[PDB]
Amino acid sequence: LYFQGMVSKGEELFGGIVPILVELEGDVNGHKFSVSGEGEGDATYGKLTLKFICTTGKLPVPWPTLVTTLVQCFSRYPDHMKQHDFFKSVMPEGYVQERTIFFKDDGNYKTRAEVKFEGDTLVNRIELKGIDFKEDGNILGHKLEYNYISHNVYITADKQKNGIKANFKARHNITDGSVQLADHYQQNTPIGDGPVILPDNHYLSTQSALSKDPNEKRDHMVLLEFVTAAGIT
């Protein structure tokens, strides 16, 4: 006699390959821009394949600084950690994801996003506001290298808000060989009133590989990303 355990509607939605759409509206120091992204996610392998296009012409900030803002529901949670997957637990109704990202010795991004299913498609709708940036600096002056980003996203339960908090320090290489710290603070809250998983402390080991489409004439970013939950057992 075997028992499979309860599987939620949310978890079940990620069993296969899911199409993804991303839409971002941004304003950094009064520079307005829009980004659209499309691709697919395969949570079984924690695998995301995405292409983003700046639909307003030249992106006024470096692509690498937008990666984290531009769907952690696609994380691979090991079987023994499935009871700690907040992100899938709230699907299809979804979650709000908010961040402040502090660029050391420069300005900050504040972001608000709605992540939910529209039919069979996982959608991430974002507004980004950046202020206090230097002319001038590594962000507005485009002084950041275009290559990998790899860090652990540290997650803790936020019982009082029925959600989670996360923190991590992203480190973007500068073209002079130095490093630009982007200190991330994050909160996620369910959109609906349903039951949610509040996890024990853990992290998402995340690796993003940035590339270009040789055939693409618009300002853009091709992304291959792997995300795996860890830190328990």
From Swiss-Prot:
<protein>
    <recommendedName>
        <fullName>Green fluorescent protein</fullName>
    </recommendedName>
</protein>
<dbReference type="Pfam" id="PF01353">
    <property type="entry name" value="GFP"/>
</dbReference>
<keyword id="KW-0157">Chromophore</keyword>
<dbReference type="InterPro" id="IPR011584">
    <property type="entry name" value="GFP-related"/>
</dbReference>
<keyword id="KW-0599">Photoprotein</keyword>
<comment type="subunit">
    <text>Monomer.</text>
</comment>
<dbReference type="InterPro" id="IPR009017">
    <property type="entry name" value="GFP"/>
</dbReference>
<comment type="similarity">
    <text>Belongs to the GFP family.</text>
</comment>
<keyword id="KW-0455">Luminescence</keyword>
<dbReference type="InterPro" id="IPR000786">
    <property type="entry name" value="Green_fluorescent_prot"/>
</dbReference>
<comment type="function">
    <text>Energy-transfer acceptor. Its role is to transduce the blue chemiluminescence of the protein aequorin into green fluorescent light by energy transfer. Fluoresces in vivo upon receiving energy from the Ca(2+)-activated photoprotein aequorin.</text>
</comment>
<dbReference type="GO" id="GO:0006091">
    <property type="term" value="P:generation of precursor metabolites and energy"/>
</dbReference>
<dbReference type="GO" id="GO:0008218">
    <property type="term" value="P:bioluminescence"/>
</dbReference>
